[PDB]
Write a protein that binds this ligand. Structure first.
Ligand SMILES: CC(=O)N[C@H]1[C@@H](O)[C@H](O)[C@@H](CO)O[C@@H]1O
Ligand SMILES: CC(=O)N[C@H]1[C@@H](O)[C@H](O)[C@@H](CO)O[C@@H]1O
Ligand SMILES: CC(=O)N[C@H]1[C@@H](O)[C@H](O)[C@@H](CO)O[C@@H]1O
Ligand SMILES: CC(=O)N[C@H]1[C@@H](O)[C@H](O)[C@@H](CO)O[C@@H]1O
Ligand SMILES: *[C@@H]1O[C@H](CO)[C@@H](O)[C@H](O)[C@H]1NC(C)=O
Ligand SMILES: *[C@@H]1O[C@H](CO)[C@@H](O)[C@H](O)[C@H]1NC(C)=O
Ligand SMILES: *[C@@H]1O[C@H](CO)[C@@H](O)[C@H](O)[C@H]1NC(C)=O
Ligand SMILES: *[C@@H]1O[C@H](CO)[C@@H](O)[C@H](O)[C@H]1NC(C)=O
Ligand SMILES: [Ca+2]
Ligand SMILES: [Ca+2]
Ligand SMILES: [Ca+2]
Ligand SMILES: [Ca+2]
Lengths: 220, 220, 220, 220
């Protein structure tokens, strides 16, 4: 009756993809999430999805903290929820990507967490922890490990300017990025530099992907 | 001990109309509501009621979010509560109306929900979902399906102006409405245009109803 | 393990006066209160106490909502807590008073409640409901029944001015009062008019009491 | 499954030092803390730690209320959490200190609490209660008993000026201090007066300690 995440939902007998209620350890009121019950056995809890550019992702700090969009479409679950999920157990991250040629690729990370040991995850900037890559899209996230989350109105990056504003996104920017999945939905090749839905290791710095989905599942 | 809504209250043995405590899935602290234990078998949870114009309904965003008025009289349960109720199960909507000639009519909708898949229902504007009409008052809500909630201080409608201000109410306005149950209590026929407690399909655009009650009950 | 109030605490075996944890129905996190386990069998939950003028009671709306002072001394439990307590069951009110001549008296009310049917008790002003008097101090509260709570910075009374400011207190003012237990601790007879810790029916309008305690216990 | 503090965690079978989830009585959502499972039998819940000056401790009221830093390094658990912990049972305080010569000392207090009887601990200033000293570092906290917590932006001390600003810290200042563990990490001897990580009874008023850790464990 109180699954902690999508894997619990799956193990309880729910095999279909869809929206379900989960109740993280330190977020007892619970909330709804979209569950991917197919990928590599299923049981993944989605926290990000781009697919048509219908939702504006160039949002400020509060929106990225609380979440926006809709579970059945493009959305960002919200950093407070991602933190509540990732700190209750050891999780891995799966990232699915797709270009405008119907081609697809993915990146899997053995460990993933946000503000794992932060007393106040929000004030500490929801620092990213991620490692152990494997997949077909190549790694475009490891260099971001250890970085705080930065938005257009809250700079915690390692650049003289605001990476989020500069690359029109919101991410665990360093100086500045190798991945920018919350960037502008520019739809394919574009002249501007690395300010679209980018995953450099796969499609470079000037190609805004058509689809992306970030999700997690207990490592053990 | 922890009914999720008025139907649970009824099924537990409480047959009288009145105020009871309910505890929605993602609103564990719970809150009180007025239960209609008579209508078509009973078990309806009320979230809106007009009956004498003693309460001001031309309120702003925060009031419509948190609720106002009193459970035993005119009131609006609050969008955050309606969301917590409607997303925990599939509900239908029953609307009771009465004119100043003691005549009455109703509208029943097979499905009803507010911000059903919104990650942050408040930021997403508590979008309305409603369908499958049947009744005696005629349908005045279907054209509103899919619309966000709009108040005098937060415009999310499809009009060049602010529908809530223009028609002195708060509703899931399009451009602008076919129903306006949270409008001014003008008491019957009135010269102003569609800015009273209107339900066009039944009493037209220039007649402010004497009584209205909106309530929900699990569909299945 | 989860008493709803001081009577539950008593019935569970705790016979000594002191501070205990209680968990109201719609306030699951719970909070601490001072329990009077002696008065007429014991089991009273205190929400107000004056005894030495060490605490400032001429506070604003937020302070009266959230509470101030200390449980072991002068304090105001806070309207949000009083509401959570009184709406979970039918309670009666007991008021103990003492003048500077060591004389004492009391007022008992068969029914007592704050914002009992208010959808949003705070926005509705935590309206007072009280009736059925009996005792030795005389009745100085019945005329206040039905009134909202008023502070120096939030006027909901029936006076052309702000009763709270005028009589230096915080109360369910009408126009203005017969009781003013949250008034200034003027210590006995005073020239100013009715702006001290007054209970008119007993000591008049120009005598600030030395001690007062307001508490509740389930009626049934 | 729901330990109230680090002692419960230990008694349940967890013998290693590390981060664990605890769920205080009036803070049911729970939060994570660092547990010291070695000191005098183990079972201590840490709420403060200095060790390298990597974290800024000259913070304002909200930061000291909500907490900052990281559980695995320098941090302040947050006064709201310390209050939730210390009011659920009788706790004692253990303070470990270390200078830059690798020397160490400690102070143990038989009783410790923050805002123990405050109706609104935050508005009341999280007053300190502490007594019964024993140890090797000498007592530098007893004179602070009874004092409210003061930050650079919220003065509740007994000085004509703001002790927190003057001594660059945050503490239960009187006029002003004998201990200042949240002071500037000045690293050893320093010319400025008592504005570093000081514990006067041991290293005087002009020596900023290298390491400090404050923790609690149920007295009984
Ligand atoms: C996308 C991104 O962050 N690019 C880096 C760096 O790799 C580029 O060479 C540089 C060009 O100005 O901008 C940046 O600092
Ligand atoms: C009540 C309401 O929303 N009326 C519509 C439309 O049906 C009317 O014809 C029009 C008249 O200006 O106003 C509106 O845009
Ligand atoms: C204490 C109090 O509220 N007194 C009333 C009324 O009884 C008095 O006669 C009047 C005198 O101005 O003030 C008031 O309006
Ligand atoms: C650290 C501290 O609080 N010192 C006290 C007092 O002991 C000193 O003598 C005095 C010197 O001005 O400052 C202070 O008021
Ligand atoms: C790509 O896939 C879609 C369905 O997902 C299909 O309709 C389309 O014809 C395919 N080809 C391209 C290049 O769009
Ligand atoms: C209407 O009904 C009320 C009672 O609900 C009754 O008192 C009244 O006489 C009836 N007729 C009219 C037109 O008011
Ligand atoms: C009143 O009672 C107190 C104890 O409560 C006592 O000390 C005192 O002598 C008594 N007389 C007066 C008038 O204070
Ligand atoms: C002090 O202890 C550390 C290890 O904790 C050690 O490396 C060092 O050599 C010791 N001596 C000094 C004075 O640093
Ligand atoms: Ca920057
Ligand atoms: Ca508009
Ligand atoms: Ca007034
Ligand atoms: Ca001062």
């Amino acid at each position: 009756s109180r699954p902690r995440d999508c894997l619990d939902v799956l193990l309880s007998g729910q095999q279909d993809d869809g929206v379900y209620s989960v109740f993280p350890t330190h977020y007892p009121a619970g909330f709804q999430v979209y569950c991917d019950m197919r990928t590599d056995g299923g049981g993944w809890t989605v926290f990000q999805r781009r697919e048509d550019g219908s939702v504006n992702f160039f949002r400020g700090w509060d929106a990225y903290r609380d979440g926006f969009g809709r579970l059945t479409g493009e959305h960002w679950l919200g950093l407070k929820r991602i933190h509540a999920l990732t700190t209750q157990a050891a999780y891995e991250l799966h990232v699915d990507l797709e270009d405008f040629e119907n081609g697809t690729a993915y990146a899997r990370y053995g460990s993933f967490g946000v503000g794992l040991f932060s007393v106040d995850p929000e004030e500490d900037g929801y620092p990213l922890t991620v490692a152990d890559y494997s997949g077909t899209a190549g790694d475009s996230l490891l260099k971001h490990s250890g970085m705080r989350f930065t938005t257009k109105d809250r700079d915690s990056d390692h650049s003289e300017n605001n990476c989020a504003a500069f690359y029109r996104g919101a991410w665990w920017y360093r100086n500045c990025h190798t991945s920018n999945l919350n960037g502008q939905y520019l739809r394919g090749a574009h002249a501007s530099y690395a300010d679209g839905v980018e995953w450099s290791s796969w499609t470079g710095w000037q190609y805004s992907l058509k689809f992306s989905e970030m999700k997690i599942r207990p490592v053990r």
